[PDB]
């Protein structure tokens, strides 16, 4: 409560980056705190309670990312010989975690952009913060293609992708939300950002995903998804009722069925819809 | 009746003595016709490959059409057997190739059987099929090419609607030069606007045979 105002300052002081990374930046900058002078209660229970307080938003990525950097501090914040440099001075490992998953956007931009086939148009979903940089690195390497955006309509959000893209002279056309079945034959392959990736291999994202995937299966066309290291989770859906209700909110975010996707990208690298499981089990030993 | 003569003579230096014999022999034609007066010859037909030559320009255009739709594999110009990075082009759909510093234009469709080299700035809305653009190229807009040849250093202005050319080093050609099949341009030609040039016109620096002088090619 007393530092969720700084999370508000981090969400609306630099609105370029993601929400979860603003939460991680918020709390790790708070680790110059009023000195609790302990390892157990401070780290475990206090950052647990801070995950409970900052999870009051309708996000799914933020709480999972908080648990994730709790696991990325559970590595070797050791019992090293004195309470002077356990973590409250030897703090730079979470700093290098922050730096690595800051440059993770750049390494996804370096990897994925050399896959887009020139000539076949690619309809994209609403504004993510990794589709923009992969298209930036693609058009930076002198391609030719077309791109459409659906609105993803609880609110108009496709034109926000238009005001994102059109600033750098790339052709685009916004298309109706329920009418992606008409445009599905026109496109040949379909990329979509993530609010988070599930252990079964499906994605969770704002609502307009699963109908894109099932029209992709009907047109037998490759469905492509993109995510970063922040957006892993431990949830398990079978049919849609079992995403958690605080992670549901007429859904404001939504799951798509796990393996009628065709290929998936992450910061660990480009991988396969069963490799998702073992490569997240690699995290949190 | 179905063969064609190409000068790939395997032979031994008995042939060397057979044209120490007739000093008036000059070519392979009177060699093989001096065989037929009586020291023996075979042919060898095959069913697999493509071997021919050119001294003309016509079957040069034919063999360049044979190279790009690849009747000469294994020998393919994208393995880049000669050694530089100035020929670095890949493959794509429809046997088309794109080199380094491509810069293809918005909506500039480029459909069948072409390549492009180094420093080939391409403008928008052009349309090119069954031809070769080489390096040192700049393109306006709506610059249609068809079975043309654009060697090193060439320029062309926008709207130059040109079919079936053969064109050489560091040449310039201005707006609305409509040009017609079976002609050639060579070695720094400059042609201005509104020339709807006819069928055949050899235009190069020599007065007595080429149909310009050491100035440009519109008028003397």
UniProtKB/Swiss-Prot annotation, chain A:
Which molecular function term from Gene Ontology is one that the record holds?
Answer: guanyl-nucleotide exchange factor activity
Q: Name one Pfam family in it.
A: IF-2B
Activity regulation info: Activated by the chemical integrated stress response (ISR) inhibitor ISRIB which stimulates guanine nucleotide exchange factor activity for both phosphorylated and unphosphorylated eIF2.
GO CC, any one term: eukaryotic translation initiation factor 2B complex
Cellular location of this protein? Cytoplasm, Cytosol
Entries under Gene3D superfamilies matching the protein: Translation initiation factor eif-2b, domain 2, Translation initiation factor eIF-2B, N-terminal domain
Question: N6-acetyllysine occurs at which residues?
Answer: 32
- Keywords assigned: Acetylation, Cytoplasm, Disease variant, Initiation factor, Leukodystrophy, Protein biosynthesis
Q: Which domain of life is it from?
A: Eukaryota
Q: Which GO terms describe its biological process?
A: cytoplasmic translational initiation; oligodendrocyte development; response to glucose; response to heat; response to peptide hormone; T cell receptor signaling pathway; translational initiation
Family listed? Belongs to the eIF-2B alpha/beta/delta subunits family.
Which disease is this protein implicated in?
A: Leukoencephalopathy with vanishing white matter 1: An autosomal recessive brain disease characterized by neurological features including progressive cerebellar ataxia, spasticity, and cognitive deficits. Brain imaging shows abnormal white matter that vanishes over time and is replaced by cerebrospinal fluid. Disease severity ranges from fatal infantile forms to adult forms without neurological deterioration. The disease is progressive with, in most individuals, additional episodes of rapid deterioration following febrile infections or minor head trauma.
Please give the function described in this protein's UniProt entry: Acts as a component of the translation initiation factor 2B (eIF2B) complex, which catalyzes the exchange of GDP for GTP on eukaryotic initiation factor 2 (eIF2) gamma subunit. Its guanine nucleotide exchange factor activity is repressed when bound to eIF2 complex phosphorylated on the alpha subunit, thereby limiting the amount of methionyl-initiator methionine tRNA available to the ribosome and consequently global translation is repressed.
Q: How does it assemble?
A: Component of the translation initiation factor 2B (eIF2B) complex which is a heterodecamer of two sets of five different subunits: alpha, beta, gamma, delta and epsilon. Subunits alpha, beta and delta comprise a regulatory subcomplex and subunits epsilon and gamma comprise a catalytic subcomplex. Within the complex, the hexameric regulatory complex resides at the center, with the two heterodimeric catalytic subcomplexes bound on opposite sides.
Could you tell me what this protein is called? Translation initiation factor eIF2B subunit alpha
Q: Which organism is it from?
A: Homo sapiens (Human)
Q: What is the lineage of its organism?
A: Eukaryota, Metazoa, Chordata, Craniata, Vertebrata
Swiss-Prot record, chain B:
The modified positions for Phosphoserine read: 204, 220
Q: Where is the signal peptide?
A: none
Residue spans of biased composition, Acidic residues class: 210-220
**Location relative to the cell:** Cytoplasm, Cytosol
Question: Where are residues bearing Phosphothreonine located in the sequence?
Answer: 76
User: Function of this protein?
Assistant: Acts as a component of the translation initiation factor 2B (eIF2B) complex, which catalyzes the exchange of GDP for GTP on eukaryotic initiation factor 2 (eIF2) gamma subunit. Its guanine nucleotide exchange factor activity is repressed when bound to eIF2 complex phosphorylated on the alpha subunit, thereby limiting the amount of methionyl-initiator methionine tRNA available to the ribosome and consequently global translation is repressed.
- Disease linked to the protein: Leukoencephalopathy with vanishing white matter 5: An autosomal recessive brain disease characterized by neurological features including progressive cerebellar ataxia, spasticity, and cognitive deficits. Brain imaging shows abnormal white matter that vanishes over time and is replaced by cerebrospinal fluid. Disease severity ranges from fatal infantile forms to adult forms without neurological deterioration. The disease is progressive with, in most individuals, additional episodes of rapid deterioration following febrile infections or minor head trauma.
Tell me what this protein is called. Translation initiation factor eIF2B subunit epsilon
- State the organism of origin: Homo sapiens (Human)
Q: What is the phylogenetic placement of the source species in the record?
A: Eukaryota, Metazoa, Chordata, Craniata, Vertebrata
UniProt lists the gene as: EIF2B5
Q: Which residues of the intact protein are shown?
A: 242 to 466 of 721
């Amino acid at each position: 409560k007393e530092l969720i105002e700084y999370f508000k300052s981090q969400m609306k002081e630099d609105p370029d980056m993601a929400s979860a990374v603003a939460a991680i930046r918020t709390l790790l900058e708070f680790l110059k705190r009023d000195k609790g002078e302990t390892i157990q209660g401070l780290r475990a229970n206090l950052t647990s309670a801070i995950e409970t307080l900052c999870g009051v938003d309708s996000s799914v990525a933020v709480s999972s990312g908080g648990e994730l950097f709790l696991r990325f501090i559970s590595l070797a914040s050791l019992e090293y010989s004195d309470y002077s440099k356990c973590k409250k001075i030897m703090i730079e490992r979470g700093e290098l975690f922050l730096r690595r998953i800051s440059l993770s956007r750049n390494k996804i931009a370096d990897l994925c952009h050399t896959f887009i086939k020139d000539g076949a148009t690619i309809l994209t979903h609403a504004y993510s913060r990794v589709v923009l940089r992969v298209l930036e690195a693609a058009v930076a390497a002198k391609k030719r293609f077309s791109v459409y955006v659906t609105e993803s309509q609880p609110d108009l959000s496709g034109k926000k992708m238009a005001k994102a893209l059109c600033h750098l002279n790339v052709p685009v056309t916004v298309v109706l939300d329920a009418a992606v079945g008409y445009i599905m034959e026109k496109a040949d392959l379909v990329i979509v950002g993530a609010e988070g990736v599930v252990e079964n291999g499906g994605i969770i994202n704002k609502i307009g995903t699963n109908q894109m995937a099932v029209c992709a299966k009907a047109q037998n066309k490759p469905f492509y998804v993109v995510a970063e290291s922040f957006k892993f989770v431990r949830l398990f859906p079978l049919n849609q009722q079992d995403v958690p209700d605080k992670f549901k909110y007429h859904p404001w975010v939504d799951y798509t069925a796990p393996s009628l996707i065709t290929l998936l990208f992450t910061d660990l690298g480009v991988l396969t819809p069963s490799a998702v499981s073992d490569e997240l089990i690699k995290l949190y030993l | 009746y179905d063969l064609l003569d190409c000068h790939i003579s395997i032979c031994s230096p008995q042939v060397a003595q057979l044209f120490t014999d007739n000093f008036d022999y000059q070519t392979r034609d009177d060699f093989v016709r001096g065989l037929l007066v009586n020291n023996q010859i075979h042919m060898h037909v095959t069913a697999k490959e493509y071997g021919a030559r050119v001294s003309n320009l016509h079957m040069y255009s034919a063999v360049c059409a044979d190279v790009i739709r690849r009747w000469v594999y294994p020998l393919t110009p994208e393995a880049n057997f000669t050694d530089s990075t100035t020929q670095s082009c890949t493959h794509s759909r429809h046997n088309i190739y794109r080199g380094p510093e491509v810069s293809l234009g918005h909506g500039s469709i480029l459909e069948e059987n072409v390549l492009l080299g180094s420093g080939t700035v391409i403008g928008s809305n052009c349309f090119i099929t069954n031809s070769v653009i080489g390096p040192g190229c700049h393109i306006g807009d709506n610059v249609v090419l068809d079975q043309t040849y654009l060697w090193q250093g060439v320029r062309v202005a926008a709207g130059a609607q040109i079919h079936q050319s053969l064109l050489c080093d560091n040449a310039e050609v201005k707006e609305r030069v409509t040009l017609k099949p079976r002609s050639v341009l060579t070695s720094q030609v400059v042609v201005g606007p509104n020339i709807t040039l006819p069928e055949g016109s050899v235009i190069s620096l020599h007065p007595p045979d080429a149909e310009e002088d050491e100035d440009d090619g519109e008028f003397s």
